[PDB]
Structure formats: C-alpha cells, structure tokens
Design a protein around this ligand. Structure first.
Ligand SMILES: Cc1cc2nc3c(=O)[nH]c(=O)nc-3n(C[C@H](O)[C@H](O)[C@H](O)COP(=O)(O)OP(=O)(O)OC[C@H]3O[C@@H](n4cnc5c(N)ncnc54)[C@H](O)[C@@H]3O)c2cc1C
Ligand SMILES: Cc1cc2nc3c(=O)[nH]c(=O)nc-3n(C[C@H](O)[C@H](O)[C@H](O)COP(=O)(O)OP(=O)(O)OC[C@H]3O[C@@H](n4cnc5c(N)ncnc54)[C@H](O)[C@@H]3O)c2cc1C
Ligand SMILES: COP(=O)(O)[C@](C)(O)c1sc(CCOP(=O)(O)OP(=O)(O)O)c(C)[n+]1Cc1cnc(C)nc1N
Ligand SMILES: COP(=O)(O)[C@](C)(O)c1sc(CCOP(=O)(O)OP(=O)(O)O)c(C)[n+]1Cc1cnc(C)nc1N
Ligand SMILES: *C1=C(C)C(=O)C(OC)=C(OC)C1=O
Ligand SMILES: *C1=C(C)C(=O)C(OC)=C(OC)C1=O
Ligand SMILES: COP(=O)(O)C(C)=O
Ligand SMILES: COP(=O)(O)C(C)=O
Ligand SMILES: [Mg+2]
Ligand SMILES: [Mg+2]
Ligand SMILES: [Mg+2]
Ligand SMILES: [Mg+2]
Ligand SMILES: [Mg+2]
Ligand SMILES: [Mg+2]
Ligand code: NA
Ligand code: NA
Ligand code: NA
Ligand code: NA
Lengths: 592, 592, 182
C-alpha cells in the first residue's frame, strides 16, 4: 500500500512500457533515482550533458513505433537544458517525457538554489508542462502525460517534481493502475470515398507521404494503397522510408534542399498532390502559389488546425493516417473490383524516366575529397537495413539528396528544428532502442563538436555505431547562405593545430578527440580509402563495441544544390544523366 | 540617412559601448553578421555551441563593471540553447544581451523551418524578451534593452529579429543617438543615519557584503566603511573579493557548503548582520530562524521586493550599494569625528582568533591525490591577482573553502544556477574582456566534459588561461548527496579506456581530448608534481597562447565538509588548528 | 465552393447543433453577424452588457445536456468583459463558446483601436483561446473547439477572429463537414 510518490511513479512507468531512461542525476531528483534503483525495471544511461540525455530520448522515441524516450534531470539548469529537445520533439510531432527535480513546494517563490519556473519556460514547446503540487497526483500526472504523448498530434511532456512531493508517502495499488485510452480521430467512409473519387479523376497524381504515416505505423498500408492505385509516392523528408527507395512507385523527394531534380520535376508535372500525414513545410513547398499551381490538393492530417494552415486543400480530412489508409485500401480494392481505377502506366513511366536521367554526380576522384563521393561509398558499404541519423548542414542536405533508405524509421532526422549536436546523442538513443539496428550517423564538423563528449557515453556503455564525419573546417551551409551577402564571415573553424600538423590547418583533430573519449576513429584523405575505412570501422565496432568515427577530409568549399523554389534549384556541382557519374541510384544498383 | 535596421543596430551597439560579441551565425541572423562586418567595430568570437557563446557573454559581463556580454545566434534551436544562460544571468542579477534571428514576420504562425516562440520561452528568465515587429523599432528596442540591463536589479535581455525586419531600410542618424539614463534608487540620509545608529548599538556586528556591492562597483567603499567602523566583513559567495582575503576585517564566508568553520562560528556569535547588496540565499543561511536568532538584521538592496522575501529585516533600505556606501562612509566619518563610533578591538580579536584556529587540512601527501592539496598548490603557484572561474561540484565547493582571492571580480562563479559546462566558456569570456587578467578555471571532470569543445575556441582565437581539472571519474557532489539514500547510483564516469591504459580505468583521457582540440595539457598523479605542472603550464601558455589544462587524478571518493545548518556542517576529512596542515590561510602566508 | 470564412463558420455551428447565440455586435465582428443573417439558422439575443451575454451562454449550456451557449462580441473590451464567464464556466467544468472580433492581422502589434491580446488574457480560464491567423482555419478551429468543449473535463473556448480573416473567401463543402469524435 504505502510507498513514496516516486516509488508509485516507477510502477506507472513500468505499466506504461518504459524500460529505458537517459539522464543526469542531481540532489533535487535523487529520490526518483532512489526509486528507480529499488524497482530495477529501467536501464539508465548517464549522459555527459543534459542536452545529450534529451536528444538520446528523441532518438529512442523515433527508432521504433510506440517508444517514448525518457530524459531525467535535476532542478534549475537541467530543465533549461532540455528546452531545445522539447522544441525539436514538438516541432516533429513526436513525444519525449522529461522529468525534472525541483525545490520543495514551500520554497518555490523564495529563490532557493537552482529553483526555476520550468513550467512557464517549457509551456510553449510541450503538450503539458506541470509542477506537481501533491504526492498523490504524481501517478495521475504521469497517467495523463502518456495519454497526451500518444493522442492526437503527438508531442512531449515535462513533469517537474518538488523534492518534498517525491519523498512523501502515498497509498498506491499497482494492480489497479491502467493506462488511459488513446484519442485518435478516424476518417469516415464518406470522406475516403470522396478522396478516392478525386484521385481517380486526376491524370498525373502523386501521393505525398509525410511523417504522420510513420508516426501512425502505417508504412505497409501506404505502400499497399500506392500499389493498388498505381500512384507515384513522394515522401517528405519526415516520411522518407515509408516506401523503399527502390520501389517502382518511389518517385523521389521534393523541396528546396533535401530533394531530387526528378522529384521536383515530377511534382511540377503533376495535377494532384494527395497528402497523407504531411504538412507542406516551407522547405518542401517553396511558395505555396507555385507548389499548388494547376494541382488539386488532398490533405489528411490527425490535427484539424494543420489543415489550411499554410495552403488551402481542395479536400481536407481529419484522421489518423493508419485509420485513413485502412479505409483507402479497402475503398481502392472495391474500386479495382468494379473496374473503376484508371491504368497509370504512362504517368508512372514518365516519373521513372525523370528518375533515370535527372541526377547529380557522386563519382569524384578529387583530392581533397568531394562530399558527394562519401554518400556513394556509404550506399555501397552499408546494407539496405542501414539506419541513418543526422541533423543539418551541407553534410545532411547532400546526404538526403544522395543516400538511399529502404525501411521506415531508417531516416532519423530532426527535420523542423535541426539543433546542432543532436546527431551523436540521437544515434546513441536509436542504438539503445534497438541493439540490432545498423546505425550510421552523418555529421559535419560543427554539428559533431557541439555535443562531442557524448561519444564517451557510447564508450562507457559499449554502444556501437558508425559515425561518418565530413570535415570541411567550416559552417559550410552558413558560408553558402552568405553568398547572398557577398561575404564569408565568422564561419571558418580552421587553425594550425599545435599538436597535429597532419590535419593541415583544419583545426580540431577529431581522431585524437574521439580516441580520448574512449572510441575508435579513422581519418581518410583520399576517395579510394573511404570504402576500406568503412570495412575497418565495422571490424573495430565488432571487436571493441564502441562508436567508430570515420572522418573524411573534404575540400573546404562545395556549394550543394538548393534554391528558393521547386523550379529554381541551382546546380553548382556537376549534374549527371548516366549511371557512371551517379552509380548508386536504385535504378542502377541492387541494394542488398 | 538610409541604411538597414541591422546597420542602425551596429551604431547603437557601438554608442552603448559594445566591442565584443560571442556567437554562432545562421541563415536567419546573417543580415546582422553582414552589418557587423561592414561596420567593423565589434570583435566576434565563434563558439562551438550556442550555449558556449551564451556563457562566454556571462563571463565577459562579470569580468569588469559596466561590461555587457553579447551572444548572437540564429532562429529556432539557437534561442532555446540560450535559455540556460538567460536563467543564470537573471539568477545572479547580471546582464547579457542575446540577439536571435527569426523567420519573416508574415511566416511566424506558419511553422516555417526553425521558427519558435522564443519571446514566450525566454520571458520567465529575462527583464525583456521581444520579437521586434518593425525595422524602425530595432534601434529603440536596443536602446530600451540597455536601460533595463543597467537599471534597478540588473538582468538579461533577448532581442529576436525577423529576417525581413533586419534587412528593411530605415532612416537613422547615428549622431542623434544617445543612451537612456540609468534608474538607480539611492538611500536618504535619514535611512543611513538609522542604520548606523543601529550598528553603533550592536556589540558583535558583522557586515555581510553581497554581489550587489560588486554589481555597483563599490568594493573600495565597502572596505572603507568596514575600516571606519571596525566591523568584520563576511562576503557572500557572490561578494567574495570585495574586501581582500588578507584584510584584518575579512572574517571568512558563511553557509552550508562554500563556507569556513570560522565564518559560521563568527556569524553564530554575532548580534547583528548588516547586509549590503546580499539577499540571504538558502545555501548561505540554512533555516532563517537559526540564521537570525539573537541578531538584528539590516538589509540594503536595490530591489524593493528582495527585502522581506526570505527573512524579515529589522531595517530594510532600498538603495544602489554605491549610493548607500557613499552615505554610510560620510555618516561614519561624522560619527567618528563626534567620538560616537565604539571601539571593537575585542570582537575583532575574537573573529581573528576563530580564523586562526578553525581550519581544514590541505597538506596531504596521499596518492591518489586529495583535492584539498590541489587548492593549497594553487594558492602557492598563482599571485594575489589571480582570477578564478568555476561552476559547481565538490571541485567548486572545496575551492571556495580553500582558495583565496584579493580583488573584486576575481571570483567569477554562477552561484545561483550552477549550470555544468559554464566554466570553460565563462573563462574564455573573462579573457576576452581582459587579456591581461590571470585567469585560472577550476572544474571537476563532469563540468569539464559538458562543453569541452569550447577549448577549441581558445585554440583558434589564441585565448590563453590555465584550466585546473580535478578528476575523480565521478559526479562527486551527487555521490555525496546520495549518502542520505544509502546508494551510489548512476554517478560514476569510469571505464577502461581502450586507447589509454595510463588513465587506469578513469574513463575519458582529458589530455588526448584537450590536445585534439588544439590546447596543451599536463596530467598529474602525485601531489609533489602539482607545483611543477603549474610552472610548466605558465610556460606553455606564454609560448603557444592557448588554454593549458592541468588534470589532477584524485582519489575516487572524498566527502567535502557541508551540512543543513550553520551549526551542523559535518567535517568528514581532517580538520586543522595549525598552519602546517593548512599552510595557505592568509594568517600564515603572504600573498604576492 | 467559395464563401467567406464567416459563412463557413455558420455551417459549422449549424452542424455542431447551435441554434442560439447571445451577444453584442460591433464593427470588428460585423462580418460574423452578416453571415449569421444570411444563413438564418441561429436566433440571436442582444444583451445589454457583454458580461450579460456571457452568463446567458452559461445558463443555456447548463439548462440541457449537450447544449453549448454561444457568446458573441466585438474586439477590445468585449473580450475582457467575457473573462468572468470563461472563469465561471471553466470553474464548474461546463462549456461556453465565446467568439470575438479582432483587428486585421497586419495591425495586431500596432495599437489599433480596441486591439487587445485576448488570447493571452483568456488562456488561464479556457481549454483553448486562439486568434485565428488564416481564413481556411476558421472552420478547423471551431471543429477543434467543439471536440474540446465536449471531451474530457468540459470547459469553454474563446475564438478570436481578425476582421480580414472573417471576410476572406475560402473553399468549403458543408456536406463534407463532420464533428470530431468526443
Ligand atoms: C537543412 C534542411 C533542409 C530541408 N529541406 C527539405 C526539403 O527540401 N524538402 C522537405 O520536404 N523537407 C525538407 N526539410 C525537412 C522539413 O523542414 C520538414 O521537417 C518536413 O518537410 C516536414 O515533413 P512532413 O510534412 O511530413 O511533416 P511532419 O513534421 O512529419 O508532420 C506532418 C503532420 O503529421 C501529422 N500527424 C502526426 N501524427 C499523425 C498520425 N498518427 N496520423 C496522421 N497525421 C499525423 C501532424 O499533425 C503534422 O501536421 C529540411 C530540413 C532541414 C534541416
Ligand atoms: C554548490 C554551491 C554551494 C554554495 N554554497 C554557498 C554557501 O555555503 N554560502 C553562500 O553564501 N553561498 C553559497 N553558494 C552561492 C549561493 O547559491 C548564492 O549564489 C549566494 O549566496 C548569493 O549571494 P548574494 O546574497 O550576495 O546574492 P546576489 O545573487 O549577488 O544578489 C544579491 C542582491 O544584489 C542586489 N543588487 C543587484 N545590483 C545591486 C546594486 N547595484 N546595488 C544593490 N543591490 C544590488 C539584487 O537585487 C539581489 O537581491 C553556493 C553555490 C553553489 C553552486
Ligand atoms: C547540490 O546538487 P546539484 O544542485 O544537484 C549541482 C551543484 O548542480 C551539481 S554538481 C554535479 C556533478 C559535478 O561533477 P564534477 O566531476 O564536475 O565535480 P565533482 O566530481 O563533484 O568534483 C552535478 C551533476 N550537479 C547537478 C547538475 C545537473 N545538470 C546540470 C545542467 N547542472 C548541474 N549543476
Ligand atoms: C539554413 O541555415 P540554418 O537554419 O541557419 C542550420 C541548418 O540550422 C545550420 S547548419 C550549420 C552549420 C553546420 O556546419 P557543419 O560543419 O556541421 O556542416 P557543413 O559544414 O554545412 O557540412 C549551422 C551553424 N546552422 C545554424 C544553427 C545554429 N545553431 C544551432 C543550435 N543550430 C543550428 N542548426
Ligand atoms: C530504373 C528506373 C529508374 C526504374 O524506374 C525502373 O523500373 C522500376 C527500373 O527497372 C526496375 C530501373 O532499373
Ligand atoms: C593571523 C590572523 C588570523 C589575523 O587575524 C592577523 O591579524 C590581522 C594576523 O596578523 C596580521 C595573522 O597573521
Ligand atoms: C568569428 O569571426 P572571424 O573573425 O572568424 C572572420 C573575420 O571571418
Ligand atoms: C547510469 O547508471 P549505472 O548503470 O551507471 C549504475 C547502476 O550505477
Ligand atoms: Mg534502409
Ligand atoms: Mg563543416
Ligand atoms: Mg585575487
Ligand atoms: Mg558539448
Ligand atoms: Mg568529478
Ligand atoms: Mg494601428
Ligand atoms: Na547499400
Ligand atoms: Na598566491
Ligand atoms: Na464586467
Ligand atoms: Na488554456
């Protein structure tokens, strides 16, 4: 019967499916740590920055449907160090549960050491942020937290626990605890029949499959619906993987940066966008006037106030993507049996022809190394089960342009917020979620430096993955954005390293740093040494069971393809219309 | 006449005295960077984490009276990464100016890439947080920002700049720009005369000199007033340095952790606390009932709502500490000339006797090294002009117990928030403020890891200082706090480093990491090698002009003295009553 | 197909079962009153204090299970005059729907006559308080409002409508509108 509030909390977490937490203890959260030790059901991973714990939790969530990453911390600056992750999780409609210690209730207005109003700070980037005011409410707040994290548009929750609230005794019967029901609206048959009637009337439709499809665990249904209707599929960056890149209907990605020449050309040639669990992000659309010109728009979203937010759909449907796709498949089957689905061989052929011809060169023998070549080598070295984790920079943009993925939740990327430092901890979090996953991270040098210390978490806990580090001794994306201002200013990271003449003025020696943090590292200067470096990295991983960093020394300056509209993406580097120049496109290469 | 809003902003910053900024550019803040380049008056230092830039700005502010550290960043996660510094600056009543880029005004409700409501997030930890809605307001918001940062209780400001607002042209005449007046209330003669009458009637008074004395640039007046009245001075942690540690009236520090046995004993023996620019923090007082028992309390504070917040003073006076101390000196001089100031030889003698006898041992020859010995060696190796920078941990607590400082702004410490990672960037910020300052940082291993990458900022920009790193492969303070829970759980950082058997299972190899980041580093295992390591560090600094890390390998477990009340501080390690055991107390050693 | 956002709002209110509103018009909410007149399905009762309209809405809700009283007002002080009712409705776990007119979007930070941040004021005493920033979202915000007023612990909602948002044309098919599940 009688236990501390925090002891009750462990029973709640266990019943809600939690088996892992990432965190940094402190005096104010010690009662919770005490409870976690006595209960024994949760594996704790000690981060080397509270921000690191917060992004580990994000990776854990993103790795596997139903996962909820947990981030623990003390009072005061621990909560403030979780805001960037709450923002990133909110921004991408995924949940993490942050739990912070706090000063005792009676001391909250008294400027106690490390007492901050985390409720007010976190409110704008959470579905709920609450300082729990009574011991008996601790289980109830967690119970509601799980309901909110799973329901509607998913998002994160912060629970703030005054010390005295944590340690007070309550009566709690674990056998009587039950998770709450999850709220998800479902499209009616009438909605879905109208959508399919509209699709049947389009001559050149595409499905734009967003992150909501993955959130809903509906990848197989999305592919089934596309196959039944013979409609090309353009994943958003957040939908990437919900149909394999080598599927005959996968028509590429669209947008201003993380996009294909063939994807943009297909979108602009289409007469309908059938949007499922997407939200028409500005870096996907450019100007919405241009994106929607001559096109009917269908938009299916779980969140009513996402529909009409940035563009007006011809038909907007409020629905969970799995519920919607179940009915879309069933209606499509009825239409097929009635002979009412049109044959789309010519439009599909046209999309595949663009995908065959409108390429970018990757096969460069240049020294110093061209980044494009790294992505080619990654495609060749890893299997189709590879799981990529990345953030933002020319590193990530060119990666999204040139790598291939074949499974949902095998592109793990903070698409809306892009906080530098996210990559290392997020990757560790994916690995903790799934120790059999083949995780390969991609970072530029600056991203890799923000939370570089988190490599030692991988060393201490023996969490193996391969980290690809593409080093230009620059904030490369920011250099490129500064061309509009005719400058290159405060974006260089180069210096003569007094301990390493072998980095040739590139500044930080990432091999020495990674090795100091307990990991393994290989530096590559020549494009023909990339493939053997990847093979060696796999061997070192197997042998030592720690992260292995493969650092490629790039040319300082490479302008990656991008523009302000779909029809305006500038190609600075060589394009390609043949496989020899772009040999790892799925049309030319069998993956696995 | 006609220039961009951001060009006007550079003229405002110049006229407001800004010469330095710390930051990380991004597309949304590039117009401001463009303006900064064209204008040329501000030295920019590129951080390797936005959080790093934010704490550099804090160090810069703290180094020298009138300084205002500037932190620049892009939209979205850059602002969220500045919250911990806004909190820390607010918490300690010091200003930083954060400036963030933002999405264009028309796009603010549209989930543009990296658009976040930073105004709402930062409001709780700033004097003003504002998204500027018109180009013409940019100079006016900055003008008001400087007024608020300097006025009343100081604190930080965040200015958020939509891209379109930055680039729009306004008409601005730099010659017509004038900073606003600064609001500071001043005590009346009637207030100060009552305070001095009350002081004259005390038999055993102490002055508690807080951070407000330093904030007001009033250290010399504080010492003058103490000398005229012959009243012992107890600095708060945030007041430390406002009278030299070797002054005959400096009676030690008080509290639960960063405090002296003699300080606590003096406070408990006193019959009056004369508080000037302090606020009676809970780690200074313990229970206020015990702190105020048998004592009259005077409290002078610039902020009305600080007076009576945690304890009821017998006399509370709203005043700037410099204004107050000017009048306190003048009234004390009148009282002296009238023969009305009592002679306090016996009480002063009693305070000095406690300071002579109630010590803690530092002189340990143990291997592995006892942390206490490190502080002894630091006192001997550095001059009286040393400037210490630190955060929190057993590292910082024992430092505050055992190091000595002789000048105001030579203890630079985030006393109220204690965010791990603060030390490295804050130190770099102090160095940037004053290139002739002799900066010595103190970190535990965990603190040192949070923002370890910032060492490469020191390497790239050639910013020299000495960083003392006391390594126990533990969150030592948290281990010690967990004794109350009979556990040692999730607080160890040790592992067998696969690249360094010479760290003997301590985990991270800080010498390899520091050297990889472009700095110099020396590891010490034996107490007699500390002094020569400090001499070598000075030589390497002079030669290479980069940070030099001196890592001392400590015993894993040392319980530092601390308790829950002034009369309850537990001494786990050996105390001392003689100089041989504690040879660097000012009574026994001449500093410089 | 094409009608003003406020015309779409009338169809949403009809489909959500509204037949009655209590209110006080003003210039900023006149487009909504215009739409209510054209549509014809709602009996308006004109109060002699906005506070009076707001407590009429409360009484209407409380009278009969499923009822949701609607309170209409202009910008500025009309919304501030509804705060007491929002508080009372919240406090007793019952819904009212308050609709306020508002200055045009481009004028929201410009101290326009009677422009107030009613979103911030009403947030503490409502399940949702929102200034609608696009015409196409007007029907979706109302759709979400009815879900929130009926679901979980019931409580009130305030919807604040910039003038330009009210009058802008959108595509809206009344036949395809369905209330959300509770
Ligand atoms: C440097 C950089 C460049 C980029 N360039 C591009 C680019 O060129 N092209 C591009 O497309 N992206 C790009 N992105 C990513 C971009 O910012 C967005 O993150 C992305 O386009 C949004 O994907 P989405 O529309 O699928 O939205 P998501 O953020 O995945 O959300 C879509 C919708 O899912 C809904 N939802 C949630 N759960 C469910 C459910 N169960 N059922 C149904 N709906 C649900 C939500 O309500 C939401 O409205 C880039 C990112 C970076 C960092
Ligand atoms: C692990 C750890 C242990 C600690 N242990 C102790 C301890 O044992 N003892 C201890 O004392 N501290 C300790 N501290 C520090 C403690 O938390 C507080 O930061 C500190 O005691 C507050 O100092 P203060 O009262 O001078 O306040 P400050 O934060 O310096 O502010 C005092 C007042 O100055 C006022 N003010 C600002 N400008 C002016 C001006 N111009 N004129 C007049 N007033 C002005 C403000 O309004 C404020 O009320 C510890 C910190 C840490 C991290
Ligand atoms: C009194 O306990 P606390 O308030 O819990 C405190 C002082 O605040 C500290 S100190 C500390 C550990 C410091 O470890 P170090 O190796 O740096 O120091 P040490 O081993 O103690 O000499 C931690 C994790 N925290 C907690 C902490 C956690 N996360 C952040 C961001 N900042 C913190 N500062
Ligand atoms: C389109 O520009 P942006 O939005 O400004 C963007 C994508 O967001 C980026 S990417 C970037 C530089 C990345 O440098 P890397 O060396 O990691 O990569 P690269 O050199 O481009 O291959 C910076 C500083 N920021 C800005 C940035 C700054 N601070 C934080 C915390 N996160 C950021 N992500
Ligand atoms: C290349 C492309 C681009 C195709 O679309 C295709 O059909 C799916 C191929 O054959 C399978 C191909 O090799
Ligand atoms: C030791 C102590 C503690 C004193 O107080 C003192 O007087 C100021 C000394 O002599 C100067 C001393 O050496
Ligand atoms: C940090 O800015 P920099 O001085 O590095 C430049 C002038 O490019
Ligand atoms: C992170 O927690 P640990 O597993 O390290 C422990 C059991 O002490
Ligand atoms: Mg894959
Ligand atoms: Mg780079
Ligand atoms: Mg000194
Ligand atoms: Mg870091
Ligand atoms: Mg330690
Ligand atoms: Mg106006
Ligand atoms: Na492959
Ligand atoms: Na000295
Ligand atoms: Na009223
Ligand atoms: Na609310």
């Amino acid at each position: 019967a009688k236990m501390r509030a925090v002891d009750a909390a462990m029973y709640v977490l266990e019943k809600e499916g939690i088996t892992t937490a990432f965190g940094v203890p402190g005096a104010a959260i010690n009662p919770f740590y005490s409870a976690m030790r006595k209960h024994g059901g949760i594996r704790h991973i000690l981060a080397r920055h509270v921000e690191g714990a917060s992004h580990m939790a994000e990776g854990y969530t993103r790795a596997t449907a139903g996962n909820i990453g947990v981030c623990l911390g003390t009072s005061g600056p621990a909560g403030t160090d979780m805001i960037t992750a709450l923002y990133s999780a909110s921004a991408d409609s995924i949940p993490i549960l942050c739990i912070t210690g706090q000063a005792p209730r009676a001391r909250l207005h008294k400027e106690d050491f490390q007492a901050v109003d985390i409720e007010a700070i976190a409110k704008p980037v959470s579905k709920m942020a609450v300082t729990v005011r009574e011991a008996a409410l601790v289980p109830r707040v967690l119970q509601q937290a799980f309901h909110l994290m799973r329901s509607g548009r998913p998002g994160p929750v912060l629970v703030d626990l005054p010390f005295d609230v944590q340690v007070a005794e309550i009566e709690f019967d674990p056998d009587m605890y039950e998770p709450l029901p999850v709220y998800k609206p479902a499209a009616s048959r009438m909605q879905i029949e109208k959508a399919v009637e509209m699709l049947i009337q389009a001559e050149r439709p595409v499905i734009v499959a967003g992150g909501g499809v993955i959130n809903a665990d509906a990848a197989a249904l999305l592919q089934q619906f596309a196959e039944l209707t013979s409609v090309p599929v353009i994943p958003t960056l957040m939908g990437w993987g919900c149909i394999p890149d080598d599927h005959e209907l996968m028509a590429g990605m669209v947008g201003l940066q993380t996009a294909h020449r063939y994807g943009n050309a297909t979108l602009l040639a289409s007469d309908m966008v059938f949007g499922i669990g997407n939200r028409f992000a500005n870096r996907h659309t450019g100007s919405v006037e241009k994106y929607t010109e001559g096109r009917k728009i269908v938009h299916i979203d779980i969140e009513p106030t996402q529909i009409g937010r940035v563009l007006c759909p011809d038909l907007g449907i409020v629905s969970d993507a799995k519920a919607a796709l179940t009915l879309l498949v069933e209606v499509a089957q009825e239409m097929q049996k009635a002979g009412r689905l049109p044959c789309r061989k010519e439009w599909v052929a046209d999309c595949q022809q663009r995908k065959r011809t409108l390429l970018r060169k990757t096969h460069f023998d240049n020294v110093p190394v061209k980044p494009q070549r790294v992505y080619e080598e990654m495609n060749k070295a890893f299997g189709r089960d590879v799981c990529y984790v990345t953030t933002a920079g020319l590193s990530q943009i060119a990666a999204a342009q040139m790598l291939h993925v074949f499974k949902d939740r095998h592109w793990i990327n903070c698409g809306q917020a892009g906080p530098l430092g996210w990559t290392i901890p997020a990757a560790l979090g994916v690995c903790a979620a799934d120790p059999k996953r083949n995780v390969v991270a991609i970072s530029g040098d600056f991203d890799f430096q923000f939370l570089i210390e988190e490599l030692a978490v991988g060393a201490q806990f023996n969490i193996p993955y391969i980290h690809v580090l593409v080093n230009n001794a620059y904030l490369g994306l920011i250099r490129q954005s500064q061309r509009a201002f005719d400058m290159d200013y405060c974006v260089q990271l180069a210096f003569e390293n007094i301990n390493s003449s072998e980095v040739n003025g590139y500044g930080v020696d990432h091999v020495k740093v990674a090795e100091g943090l307990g990991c393994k590292a290989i530096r590559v200067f020549k494009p023909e040494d990339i493939a053997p470096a990847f093979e060696q990295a796999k061997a070192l991983m197997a042998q030592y069971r720690v992260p292995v960093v493969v650092e490629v020394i790039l040319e300082r300056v490479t302008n990656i393809s991008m523009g302000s509209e779909l029809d305006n993406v500038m190609e600075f580097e060589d394009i390609a219309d043949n496989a020899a120049d772009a040999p790892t496109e799925t049309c030319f290469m069998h993956y696995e």
